[PDB]
Amino acid sequence: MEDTYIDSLDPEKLLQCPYDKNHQIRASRFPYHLIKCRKNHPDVANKLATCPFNARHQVPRAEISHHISSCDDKSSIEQD
Ligand SMILES: [Zn+2]
Numbered sequence: 001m002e003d004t005y006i007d008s009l010d011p012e013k014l015l016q017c018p019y020d021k022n023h024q025i026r027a028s029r030f031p032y033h034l035i036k037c038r039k040n041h042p043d044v045a046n047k048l049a050t051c052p053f054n055a056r057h058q059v060p061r062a063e064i065s066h067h068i069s070s071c072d073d074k075s076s077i078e079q080d
């Protein structure tokens with residue numbers, strides 16, 4: 001790792017951020033951005049839970065409880 005032949009001949013690729021598409025962070029710095037960026041997004045920081053009524057309904061684990069009561073008869077319309 002201190003050799004005379006450096007790896008990655010690419011100018012360091014930019015990885016897209018799952019938290020926000022406006023974030024393009026270099027591969028080596030991406031893991032760090034992955035850590036900090038979720039802390040700025042509690043919705044994803046608390047992870048997503050799968051609705052037992054519908055697999056498309058992935059909600060923050062803090063809101064899953066509220067979503068269950070709001071998805072009793074299903075058809076929970078959120079931003080749709
Ligand atoms: Zn980000």
Ligand SMILES: [Zn+2]
Pocket residue numbers: 051052053054057067071074076
């Ligand atoms: Zn649901």
